[PDB]
RNA sequence: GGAGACGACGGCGGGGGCCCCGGGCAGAGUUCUCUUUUCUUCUUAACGGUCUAUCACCCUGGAAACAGUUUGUCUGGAGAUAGGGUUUAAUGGCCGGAAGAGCCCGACACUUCUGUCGGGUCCGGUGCGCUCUCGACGUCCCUUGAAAAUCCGCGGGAGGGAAUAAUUCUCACGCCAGGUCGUACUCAUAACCGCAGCAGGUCCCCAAGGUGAACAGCCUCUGGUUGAUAGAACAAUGUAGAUAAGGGAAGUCGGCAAAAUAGAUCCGUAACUUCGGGAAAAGGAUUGGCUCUAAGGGUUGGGCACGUGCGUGCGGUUAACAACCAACUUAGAACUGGUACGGACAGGGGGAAUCUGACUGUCUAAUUAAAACAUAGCAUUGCG
RNA sequence: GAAGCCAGAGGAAACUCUGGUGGAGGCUCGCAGCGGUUCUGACGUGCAAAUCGAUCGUCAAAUCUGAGCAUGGGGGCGAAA
């Protein structure tokens, strides 16, 4: 956060990295494998 | 790689400022590689340029201020800076009482509470100065109205 | 009384079992507030599953879709799915969960 | 820009020999239909609610005249 | 007698009213000449001729 | 004959825009905790139609027990009040323009070419607010505040005019035409002048939020910049900003400089005076926060008998009552922190006298701003 | 806070007193603007052949200012230095 010089880039404006993603659920403990996280990446 | 031309072109197409275009850093060749508006439409389009939105400026504190206010808090002699004509004038003061005097003389004579010469002579003690207020002049034509009646009483 | 019919689609995460549909009504239940004080449901608001990953409002009073977004986000950001999971209305009363755009990197 | 609020004076201004086009614009939500027809001078404007006499009125105006649906879109 | 406010907003509600009652009778002779439109596109063919 | 066509200043009222508050749809941000949250979009042109808008004018009628009436005392037997109408004036409401636009959001497509399709764009309030415009008043003058091009109305009745029909109709629609030159950009701490990309100078329009009396100072939004050689160290002497025990002008030609005073509310205020002033004289008391109390407003609305929502003939001034709505001031009281309470900023030191010029004003651009000059007042001379 | 105006208390009246209203003045504090008082000021081959800073005067007018035009050296103009 840096609001009293500049507002937060929406975050529909960025593209979500499938690895940071990935590692994220990993790390909350869901099961990326058996889901396919890589069918719903977009390249 | 110079992108001053696609910024303020970008910028010309949002319709904003210079300051909230936001060009990608990652895919600076293909911003460079656009030199005409409709591309710049296409890159917005695609996501390349986007738009930013304006900088925090709330009226929350400015809110609760007024509440306090409202409700009579920062009121006191040391919040006071200028002088009491300055903050309210005695001759706005005036014409909001003369105001509200004249237009319930002229509600009581339609209505019939009072006759004309009733009306004329309160009229001119209110020009005069004699009725602080609404409940002042109502209680003065109570008054009377009794004075009258306890007079036709007697005759 | 007028009635407004709320739904919480969260289908997909729910299937991919990140969303957790139970605790979100419980979150639900325990936050919603009437007149300005939570715990105060009652006949007013009633908060119930119609399966398949969705949560179903019912409300006699003037709950705001916006208010039920807000609190939609609230628990995600409870659950550390606010940088990940997006609250999109997709028609009248109906707001569904969804993920963000993926790059493939 | 005229309204035309009589069915016997826009049935004289579309038998006009200056009447260029017409036009048909259905607006759902007010529930209204608008005629609208160019002239030299003015587009004269037409505004009925919603019926099937308000389709059947495009029958008894000219079978010269063009009369074109209005799209969604203005497109440029 | 000098008239009151209750007297002077019913002389302002009835004219108010006048003009929705005209408003409301030109909209239906408007719709009625809609329905007899054809005899109308008739005559003034007929006038023209 | 009207228009073109006319000063400065003061308060009041209407309208547009901006500012502010509330609800709703959508989007975005915050989310240890709190926050039904905070912010963003929610717009409507020219040109027209239609219904209304202060002044004023018209009709009835004849006013003292004078009345109407403005914030501001003007109006009325040269006809007021009242009742009923006619009109100058829209940047007012509705409709056409015009949602088909613009804006916001979403879902697909997309090597490019290119996009495609949905959903909306809504409902209110407030004001000693800022700004522009309009209107009625008022004040000042030994000052009385342009002209012309051009356009219109009227007086007048010369002519021209009908039933082979006539029409020389400022009505509606229709037909035709509108040449020449300028138009980029800067308008300034780099586009002009100063020899220069020079801290100088150079005429205007639009002008957000908070504090506050305030287009003061300080902070913020939109929009702009982040440009004026850099790096390291922290000696003397400087320049700029501060503090200092005790004493308090002992310093010095000379309190030079600096410090002290300062906003607001209340108490109170001398000599002198041309009676207008002096005067913010002098000298004192107080000022935060929090929880309350009190006062100061707007809109709507009266019972019968008939004819049939109005017309009458009545009857009454406890509507002194109810319902709804709304904002900023003022006074009072308790509690409470304290070394500070106009906590930064902002912001008179005061007094006793003398000389001097009546005052406001003006000049020595680039060493002198003054008892100099001018000023109103007074007196003299010349001119029919 | 000047005329003018309203109400009340007196006074035979003319006038006197009190509370308001009103908004005059080549009035006054003071932002901009215009000007230029003082500082052992800065600067002194300067940013500048007159600049910078603080302070000061005035601020509804004998105020400030643009463009067009007029006055030309035995001259003009001059609130006169």
Request: proline content about 3%; overall charge positive.
């Amino acid at each position: 956060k840096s609001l009293k010089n500049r507002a937060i880039i929406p975050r529909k404006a960025v593209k979500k990295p499938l690895s940071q993603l990935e590692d994220h659920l990993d790390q909350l403990g869901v099961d990326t494998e058996a889901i396919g996280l890589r069918a719903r990446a977009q390249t | 790689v110079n992108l001053r031309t696609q910024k303020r072109l970008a910028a010309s197409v949002l319709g904003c400022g210079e300051g909230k275009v936001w060009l990608d850093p990652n895919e600076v060749s293909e911003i460079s590689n656009a030199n005409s508006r409709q591309s710049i439409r296409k890159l917005v389009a695609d996501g390349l340029i986007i738009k930013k939105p304006v900088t925090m400026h709330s009226r929350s504190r400015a809110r609760e201020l007024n509440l306090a206010r409202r409700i009579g808090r920062h009121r006191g002699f040391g919040k006071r800076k200028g002088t009491a004509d300055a903050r309210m004038p005695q001759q706005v003061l005036w014409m909001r009482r003369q105001r509200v005097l004249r237009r319930l003389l002229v509600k009581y004579r339609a209505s019939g509470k009072i006759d004309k010469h009733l009306y004329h002579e309160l009229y001119h003690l209110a020009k005069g100065n004699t009725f602080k207020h609404k409940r002042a002049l109502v209680e003065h034509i109570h008054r009377a109205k009794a004075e009258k009646a306890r007079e036709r009483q007697i005759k | 009384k007028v009635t407004k019919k709320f739904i919480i689609n969260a289908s997909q995460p729910a299937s991919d079992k990140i969303f957790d549909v139970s605790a979100f009504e419980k979150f639900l239940n325990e936050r919603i507030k009437v007149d300005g004080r939570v715990g105060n449901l009652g006949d007013v608001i009633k908060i119930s599953q119609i399966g398949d990953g969705k949560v179903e409002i019912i409300a006699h009073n003037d709950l705001s879709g916006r208010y039920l977004k807000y609190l939609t986000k609230k628990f995600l950001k409870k659950m550390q799915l606010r940088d990940w999971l997006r609250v999109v209305a997709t028609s009248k009363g109906v707001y569904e969960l969804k993920f963000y755009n993926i790059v493939n990197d | 820009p005229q309204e035309v609020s009589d069915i016997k004076k826009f049935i004289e201004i579309c038998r006009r020999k200056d009447a260029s086009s017409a036009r048909i614009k259905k607006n759902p939500k007010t529930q209204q239909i608008k005629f609208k027809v160019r002239c030299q001078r003015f587009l004269y404007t037409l505004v009925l609610k919603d019926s099937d006499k308000a389709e059947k009125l495009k029958q008894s105006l000219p079978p010269n005249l063009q009369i074109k649906d209005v799209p969604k879109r203005n497109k440029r | 007698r000098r008239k009151t406010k209750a007297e002077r907003n019913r002389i302002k509600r009835r004219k108010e009213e006048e003009r929705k009652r005209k408003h409301e009778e030109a909209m239906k002779r408007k719709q009625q000449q809609l329905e007899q439109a054809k005899k109308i596109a008739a005559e003034v063919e007929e006038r023209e001729r």
